[PDB]
Design a protein around this ligand. Sequence first.
Ligand SMILES: [Cl-]
Ligand SMILES: [Cl-]
Ligand SMILES: [Cl-]
Ligand SMILES: [Mg+2]
Length: 203
Amino acid sequence: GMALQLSREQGITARGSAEIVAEFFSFGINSILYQRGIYPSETFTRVQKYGLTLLVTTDLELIKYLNNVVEQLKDWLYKSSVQKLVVVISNIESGEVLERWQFDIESDKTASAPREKSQKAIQDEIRSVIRQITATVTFLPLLEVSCSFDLLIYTDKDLVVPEKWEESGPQFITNSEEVRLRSFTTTIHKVNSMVAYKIPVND
Ligand SMILES: [Cl-]
Ligand SMILES: [Cl-]
Ligand SMILES: [Cl-]
Ligand SMILES: [Mg+2]
């Protein structure tokens, strides 16, 4: 007679996309911090995500810091207010900017009914991007200096700056080359990934 179905959220909503992208950044930032030795290897634990074994921090302060960033990102991503996220890697002793992991975000401001793209398909794309973050490091110059990180979120100039957040300098890098990574999309957001790395000197 009449076909009924118990509602089961399939596809992607603007909220779902924001969730997905913010989560990707949490895992991506964790991978970069581990791969560039920002935090010691023993401060990371193995976890399953996107069909991969990924390393995520156990450091209490870093967990809270990154969680705070991810929560804020979801809000701004839903609003289509994030233009890019950059993980700046600098020589801890000199402050020299050595790498800039740049994630340019494109948004569908019209995002309404849920979009027809499976979570699986999206995870498949993210999986390749995450693998490429680790793969890319094997092609960069050997890093043999202790470094620090800065996480910069570039937003629409008109956004309200929440408490605890601050307008920061751009942390310009110079004498760099780039490695373009695979992009991924939820159909609502598209995340482009690339790393700008400084060419060292023959000293
Ligand atoms: Cl781009
Ligand atoms: Cl690899
Ligand atoms: Cl720059
Ligand atoms: Mg040297």
